[PDB]
Design an enzyme around this catalytic site. Structure first.
Site, PDB file in Angstrom:
ATOM      1  N   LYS A  47       8.206  -5.482  -8.840  1.00 51.87           N
ATOM      2  CA  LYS A  47       7.945  -6.760  -9.501  1.00 51.87           C
ATOM      3  C   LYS A  47       6.513  -7.111  -9.749  1.00 51.87           C
ATOM      4  O   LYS A  47       6.235  -7.767 -10.730  1.00 51.87           O
ATOM      5  CB  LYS A  47       8.441  -7.882  -8.635  1.00 51.87           C
ATOM      6  CG  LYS A  47       9.954  -7.906  -8.464  1.00 51.87           C
ATOM      7  CD  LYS A  47      10.280  -9.025  -7.515  1.00 51.87           C
ATOM      8  CE  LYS A  47      11.416  -8.712  -6.650  1.00 51.87           C
ATOM      9  NZ  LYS A  47      11.817  -9.972  -5.998  1.00 51.87           N
ATOM     10  N   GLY A  48       5.614  -6.745  -8.826  1.00 53.84           N
ATOM     11  CA  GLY A  48       4.282  -7.285  -8.771  1.00 53.84           C
ATOM     12  C   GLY A  48       3.318  -6.848  -9.846  1.00 53.84           C
ATOM     13  O   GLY A  48       2.365  -7.577 -10.225  1.00 53.84           O
ATOM     14  N   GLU A 107      -2.063   2.949  -3.303  1.00 58.89           N
ATOM     15  CA  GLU A 107      -2.271   3.131  -1.885  1.00 58.89           C
ATOM     16  C   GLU A 107      -1.937   4.552  -1.452  1.00 58.89           C
ATOM     17  O   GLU A 107      -2.746   5.450  -1.643  1.00 58.89           O
ATOM     18  CB  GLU A 107      -1.386   2.161  -1.130  1.00 58.89           C
ATOM     19  CG  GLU A 107      -2.126   0.979  -0.646  1.00 58.89           C
ATOM     20  CD  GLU A 107      -1.332   0.200   0.403  1.00 58.89           C
ATOM     21  OE1 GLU A 107      -0.696  -0.831  -0.020  1.00 58.89           O
ATOM     22  OE2 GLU A 107      -1.368   0.640   1.612  1.00 58.89           O
ATOM     23  N   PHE A 156      -4.899  -6.228   4.399  1.00 58.39           N
ATOM     24  CA  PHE A 156      -3.644  -6.771   3.946  1.00 58.39           C
ATOM     25  C   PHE A 156      -3.955  -7.785   2.868  1.00 58.39           C
ATOM     26  O   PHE A 156      -4.477  -8.827   3.191  1.00 58.39           O
ATOM     27  CB  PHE A 156      -2.993  -7.536   5.101  1.00 58.39           C
ATOM     28  CG  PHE A 156      -1.501  -7.687   4.988  1.00 58.39           C
ATOM     29  CD1 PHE A 156      -0.903  -8.062   3.794  1.00 58.39           C
ATOM     30  CD2 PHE A 156      -0.698  -7.478   6.121  1.00 58.39           C
ATOM     31  CE1 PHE A 156       0.468  -8.178   3.702  1.00 58.39           C
ATOM     32  CE2 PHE A 156       0.670  -7.598   6.053  1.00 58.39           C
ATOM     33  CZ  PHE A 156       1.248  -7.962   4.847  1.00 58.39           C
ATOM     34  N   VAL A 157      -3.583  -7.517   1.622  1.00 60.24           N
ATOM     35  CA  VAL A 157      -3.967  -8.394   0.511  1.00 60.24           C
ATOM     36  C   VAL A 157      -2.726  -8.970  -0.148  1.00 60.24           C
ATOM     37  O   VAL A 157      -1.694  -8.318  -0.230  1.00 60.24           O
ATOM     38  CB  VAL A 157      -4.803  -7.693  -0.589  1.00 60.24           C
ATOM     39  CG1 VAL A 157      -6.180  -7.409  -0.075  1.00 60.24           C
ATOM     40  CG2 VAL A 157      -4.168  -6.392  -1.008  1.00 60.24           C
ATOM     41  N   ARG A 169       2.722 -14.291  -4.625  1.00 62.07           N
ATOM     42  CA  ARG A 169       2.488 -13.562  -5.869  1.00 62.07           C
ATOM     43  C   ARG A 169       1.898 -14.447  -6.994  1.00 62.07           C
ATOM     44  O   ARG A 169       1.286 -13.966  -7.897  1.00 62.07           O
ATOM     45  CB  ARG A 169       3.793 -12.961  -6.401  1.00 62.07           C
ATOM     46  CG  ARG A 169       4.534 -12.060  -5.470  1.00 62.07           C
ATOM     47  CD  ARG A 169       5.569 -11.351  -6.328  1.00 62.07           C
ATOM     48  NE  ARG A 169       6.580 -10.717  -5.524  1.00 62.07           N
ATOM     49  CZ  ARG A 169       6.582  -9.452  -5.184  1.00 62.07           C
ATOM     50  NH1 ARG A 169       5.597  -8.632  -5.543  1.00 62.07           N
ATOM     51  NH2 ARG A 169       7.582  -8.973  -4.489  1.00 62.07           N
TER      52      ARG A 169
END
Length: 184
Positions: A47-48, A107, A156-157, A169
């Site tokens: 989704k992001g 990542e 952690f973002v 989001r």
């Protein structure tokens, strides 16, 4: 208008809304030059990645179509195996197209490398990745993006498509969470 309590969950801001807009301008110019007059298909993994895609496509000044995939990785432990379930495939052919996968963050690369291999197998004319964020020291798979907005340490973002338990989001910027929010 930035009053929501969510904003106080951030230890620091790594990219402001303005920074992200500027990144989109810069990457957009480069992609315009690279894809001028080509059959460009921009593909977002749900989704992001949709938020970055949206802002980026505005700055790509040549004809393009768009498409979306929804996938679900298998894990052993909490690391991806490379086996990837296709919840929703592309809706159109990409044979002889120039495909640009648009990502919010790169990542481990493990899921992305499977996606990439499926799409190569469809006789694309070419395939490249644009990613807003890159954590280069988390890479497991043998993959790197051609176009990269910002390299970051392994924090952690959240924000601008990136979630913690489905939330955050909608933030127009990207930042780090307080460890008190995600700890046990």
């Amino acid at each position: 208008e930035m009053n929501s309590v969510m904003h106080n969950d951030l230890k620091e801001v790594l990219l402001t809304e303005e920074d992200i807009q500027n990144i989109c301008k810069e990457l957009g110019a480069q992609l315009t030059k690279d894809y001028q007059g080509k059959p460009l298909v921009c593909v977002g993994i749900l989704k992001g990645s949709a938020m970055f895609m949206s802002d980026l496509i505005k700055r790509i000044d040549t004809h393009l179509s768009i498409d979306f995939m929804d996938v679900s990785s298998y894990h052993g432990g909490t690391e991806s195996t490379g086996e990837v379930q296709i919840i929703k495939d592309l809706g159109s052919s990409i044979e002889n197209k120039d495909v640009l996968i648009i990502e919010d963050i790169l990542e481990t690369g493990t899921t992305l490398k499977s996606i990439t291999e499926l799409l190569q197998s469809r006789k694309v004319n070419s395939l490249e990745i644009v990613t807003l964020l890159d954590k280069p020291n988390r890479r497991k798979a043998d993959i790197e993006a051609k176009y990269v907005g910002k390299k970051i340490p392994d924090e952690f973002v959240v924000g601008y498509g990136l979630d913690y338990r489905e939330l955050y989001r909608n933030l127009p910027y990207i930042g780090t969470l307080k460890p008190e929010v995600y700890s046990n």
